[PDB]
Amino acid sequence: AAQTNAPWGLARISSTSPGTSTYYYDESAGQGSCVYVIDTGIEASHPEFEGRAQMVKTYYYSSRDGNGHGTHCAGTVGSRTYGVAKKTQLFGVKVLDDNGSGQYSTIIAGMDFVASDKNNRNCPKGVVASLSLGGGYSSSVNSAAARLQSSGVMVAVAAGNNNADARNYSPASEPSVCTVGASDRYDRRSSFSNYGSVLDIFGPGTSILSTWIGGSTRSISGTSMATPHVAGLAAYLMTLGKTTAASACRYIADTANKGDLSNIPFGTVNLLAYNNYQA
Ligand SMILES: [Ca+2]
């Protein structure tokens, strides 16, 4: 399949070179997989989601996304126009309030929720979770991410937007999950992207067009934007039978575009997510 005039990030993940605008992907498109978006919620009624999105949990007085950030992330995972895995099922878990804030205890509960809740969903090709959030180092937050992964969910988490070493951030610093840094349209590390040995992969994170609340669309930037590219990619690869939740991060790193990013600090992986699709 070919989607012309795609957001640059989708084009990038299906390309061996920057500077193209068509996204190429196998038509299976993540069908039969599920991706949890643990964030501010998802505006499931957005036409871009086509009835494939659902809120399954909130820790606040509403499950609606009153922020937009969760909707944007979900859009990058699986919206018709702006998504990597255009046929995946999206499940929203609102651990962040409408200001994008959440207490670590709520974030942890949301992770353990997903580890159980996948048993209540139909996801024959596998389960993924996208965590576009973070704060300072917490062993408890890291452990929750590790549990979610261990339970059979491909966990992708943002590296963080501090232009600092991700070792000091959670869940970014958890070795057993997939920690995702951000790049720009010209294959430069995003100016704000964290780095360090704990990163596993980079994805497109600067100026990413996706869905927003009020049935709209929006370009924003962050490792929060790179993460769902990787999460959607995992779902897509799992539907293809190429990998599984336990090894998807490794497989993505193994099959990535290598050594093509600039401004990667010494010691950080130079790996950009790539679907290796031969149209
Ligand atoms: Ca790892």
XYZ file of C-alpha atoms and ligand atoms in Angstrom:
280
model
C 0.000 0.000 0.000
C 1.022 3.601 -0.646
C -0.354 6.696 1.050
C 0.689 9.787 -0.905
C 1.370 13.147 0.759
C 1.663 11.482 4.152
C 2.956 13.202 7.269
C 6.760 13.187 6.986
C 7.122 10.775 9.919
C 5.081 8.014 8.291
C 7.043 8.456 5.085
C 10.278 8.353 7.087
C 9.480 5.072 8.816
C 8.978 3.377 5.440
C 12.031 4.915 3.784
C 15.758 4.256 3.504
C 16.264 8.019 3.006
C 14.802 11.262 4.383
C 12.988 13.756 2.168
C 10.149 11.653 0.731
C 6.410 12.058 1.358
C 4.759 8.722 0.575
C 4.128 6.147 3.302
C 4.461 2.510 2.160
C 3.065 -0.349 4.243
C 1.608 -3.825 3.949
C -2.194 -3.599 3.611
C -2.711 -5.772 6.734
C -1.986 -2.504 8.541
C -1.945 -3.864 12.112
C -5.320 -5.583 11.769
C -5.892 -8.003 14.667
C -3.487 -6.152 16.954
C -4.278 -3.753 19.805
C -2.505 -0.655 21.033
C -3.129 0.914 24.433
C -2.420 4.635 24.617
C -1.699 5.564 28.226
C -2.087 9.310 28.298
C -4.727 12.055 28.584
C -7.364 9.904 26.849
C -8.541 9.576 23.235
C -11.343 11.403 21.489
C -12.689 8.119 20.118
C -15.449 9.856 18.119
C -12.892 11.500 15.846
C -13.671 10.469 12.243
C -9.985 9.627 11.834
C -10.391 6.643 14.186
C -13.203 5.039 12.190
C -14.786 3.367 15.237
C -11.524 1.549 16.039
C -10.849 3.632 19.175
C -12.391 3.176 22.627
C -11.727 4.545 26.100
C -11.358 1.603 28.481
C -10.171 3.338 31.670
C -9.905 6.672 33.428
C -8.830 7.722 36.953
C -10.541 11.066 36.660
C -14.067 12.344 36.624
C -14.221 11.917 32.870
C -12.659 9.610 30.293
C -12.755 12.346 27.660
C -9.497 13.790 26.380
C -9.792 17.433 27.443
C -6.177 18.089 26.444
C -5.521 16.695 22.968
C -2.148 15.109 23.637
C -3.533 11.561 24.058
C -5.624 11.967 20.908
C -2.581 13.123 18.964
C -0.533 10.133 20.127
C -3.348 7.697 19.348
C -3.618 9.310 15.910
C 0.035 8.553 15.208
C -0.444 4.954 16.282
C -3.520 4.240 14.223
C -5.596 7.032 12.657
C -6.562 6.496 9.016
C -4.525 9.447 7.763
C -1.883 10.070 10.396
C -1.346 6.553 11.724
C 1.313 3.903 11.291
C -1.035 0.951 11.900
C -4.226 2.043 10.199
C -6.291 -1.056 11.092
C -5.254 -1.573 14.736
C -7.662 -1.373 17.673
C -6.889 1.591 19.937
C -7.630 1.497 23.679
C -7.370 4.662 25.749
C -6.213 4.671 29.364
C -6.490 8.120 30.932
C -3.752 8.321 33.588
C -3.095 12.004 32.890
C -5.510 14.836 33.673
C -6.517 17.485 31.166
C -3.372 19.477 31.996
C -1.265 16.429 31.040
C -0.325 15.743 34.660
C -0.570 12.522 36.636
C 0.594 11.229 39.979
C 3.002 8.318 39.684
C 0.595 6.077 41.628
C -2.089 6.639 38.989
C 0.378 6.050 36.173
C 1.409 2.773 37.826
C -2.197 1.666 38.276
C -2.787 2.379 34.577
C 0.111 0.140 33.585
C -1.011 -2.737 35.780
C -4.506 -2.171 34.423
C -3.320 -2.768 30.875
C -1.424 -5.914 31.894
C -4.734 -7.393 33.071
C -7.100 -5.684 30.661
C -5.494 -7.213 27.561
C -7.118 -10.444 28.745
C -10.474 -8.738 28.188
C -9.690 -7.714 24.616
C -9.482 -9.485 21.296
C -5.920 -9.048 20.041
C -4.867 -12.227 18.217
C -1.816 -10.589 16.599
C -0.551 -9.110 19.861
C -0.712 -6.170 22.249
C 1.263 -2.922 22.413
C 1.286 -0.010 24.850
C 2.403 3.513 24.056
C 3.484 5.592 27.070
C 4.089 9.189 26.086
C 4.868 10.358 29.596
C 7.627 10.576 32.143
C 9.081 12.169 35.228
C 12.130 11.788 37.422
C 13.660 8.424 38.258
C 11.344 6.105 40.183
C 12.043 2.417 40.699
C 8.314 1.826 41.216
C 7.433 3.398 37.866
C 10.160 1.389 36.170
C 8.903 -1.808 37.805
C 5.330 -1.186 36.605
C 6.633 -0.751 33.062
C 8.639 -3.955 33.470
C 5.551 -5.827 34.685
C 3.488 -4.617 31.745
C 6.189 -5.777 29.338
C 6.643 -9.063 31.165
C 2.889 -9.729 30.915
C 3.158 -9.902 27.113
C 2.711 -6.284 26.020
C 5.205 -4.524 23.780
C 5.892 -1.446 25.867
C 7.143 1.694 24.114
C 7.955 4.732 26.272
C 9.138 8.278 25.587
C 12.808 9.023 26.288
C 11.851 12.487 27.574
C 12.198 16.063 26.358
C 14.987 17.363 28.590
C 17.973 17.188 26.185
C 19.487 15.084 28.959
C 20.501 11.505 29.738
C 17.333 9.387 30.024
C 18.923 7.341 32.840
C 17.444 9.945 35.243
C 13.872 9.525 34.012
C 11.096 6.931 34.385
C 9.807 4.829 32.754
C 12.483 5.856 30.201
C 15.302 4.279 32.224
C 13.680 0.845 32.459
C 15.914 -1.542 30.478
C 13.187 -4.106 29.674
C 10.942 -1.698 27.730
C 11.492 0.172 24.466
C 12.780 3.685 25.114
C 12.215 6.000 22.188
C 14.090 9.175 21.282
C 12.964 11.754 18.740
C 14.344 12.857 15.363
C 13.448 15.558 12.837
C 12.671 15.707 9.137
C 16.348 16.100 8.254
C 17.477 13.098 10.318
C 18.838 15.228 13.134
C 18.224 14.304 16.753
C 15.354 16.500 17.928
C 16.803 19.404 19.899
C 14.815 18.443 23.013
C 15.266 14.677 22.786
C 16.831 12.858 25.700
C 19.620 10.411 24.862
C 21.856 7.884 26.621
C 22.553 4.156 26.807
C 18.980 3.459 27.938
C 17.545 4.474 24.550
C 16.696 1.603 22.219
C 15.469 3.452 19.149
C 14.604 6.773 17.548
C 11.407 7.759 15.771
C 10.065 10.934 14.109
C 9.265 13.471 16.835
C 9.611 17.006 15.494
C 6.634 18.660 13.760
C 4.338 15.639 13.690
C 0.866 16.136 12.220
C -1.898 14.086 13.859
C -5.420 14.156 15.300
C -6.499 16.610 17.989
C -9.627 17.091 20.096
C -12.682 18.847 18.666
C -12.354 16.645 15.575
C -9.327 18.630 14.427
C -5.641 18.112 13.578
C -2.435 19.542 14.893
C 1.345 19.480 14.467
C 3.275 19.172 17.734
C 6.686 17.879 18.794
C 8.133 15.533 21.385
C 9.471 12.121 22.286
C 5.731 11.664 22.984
C 5.302 11.813 19.193
C 8.186 9.461 18.381
C 6.920 6.819 20.797
C 3.620 6.113 19.009
C 5.477 5.750 15.688
C 7.375 2.896 17.342
C 4.249 1.514 19.043
C 2.322 1.555 15.749
C 5.306 -0.033 14.019
C 5.387 -2.842 16.585
C 1.677 -3.520 16.085
C 2.151 -3.548 12.305
C 5.082 -5.966 12.541
C 3.230 -8.190 14.988
C 0.274 -8.472 12.607
C 2.741 -9.431 9.856
C 4.060 -12.215 12.091
C 7.577 -10.740 11.961
C 7.980 -10.399 15.717
C 6.235 -10.715 19.095
C 5.676 -8.459 22.107
C 8.766 -9.789 23.864
C 11.163 -9.162 21.000
C 9.602 -6.350 18.963
C 11.861 -3.633 20.366
C 14.930 -5.756 19.621
C 13.592 -6.560 16.130
C 12.943 -2.891 15.427
C 16.497 -2.014 16.513
C 17.871 -4.945 14.467
C 16.058 -3.815 11.299
C 16.419 -0.049 11.798
C 18.133 2.476 9.564
C 21.584 2.590 11.141
C 24.080 5.411 11.545
C 21.954 7.917 9.584
C 21.050 10.361 12.356
C 23.091 13.442 13.193
C 23.783 14.968 16.606
C 23.638 11.582 18.335
C 25.836 11.808 21.441
C 28.658 9.300 21.723
C 27.292 6.148 23.340
C 23.674 6.561 22.249
C 22.279 4.214 19.584
C 22.090 5.627 16.073
C 19.021 3.702 15.007
C 15.878 5.023 13.295
C 12.693 2.944 13.192
C 12.064 1.479 9.745
C 9.408 -0.952 8.510
C 11.563 -2.589 5.809
C 8.526 -2.741 3.562
C 9.241 -3.645 -0.034
C 6.207 -2.284 -1.863
Ca 16.004 -3.394 26.262
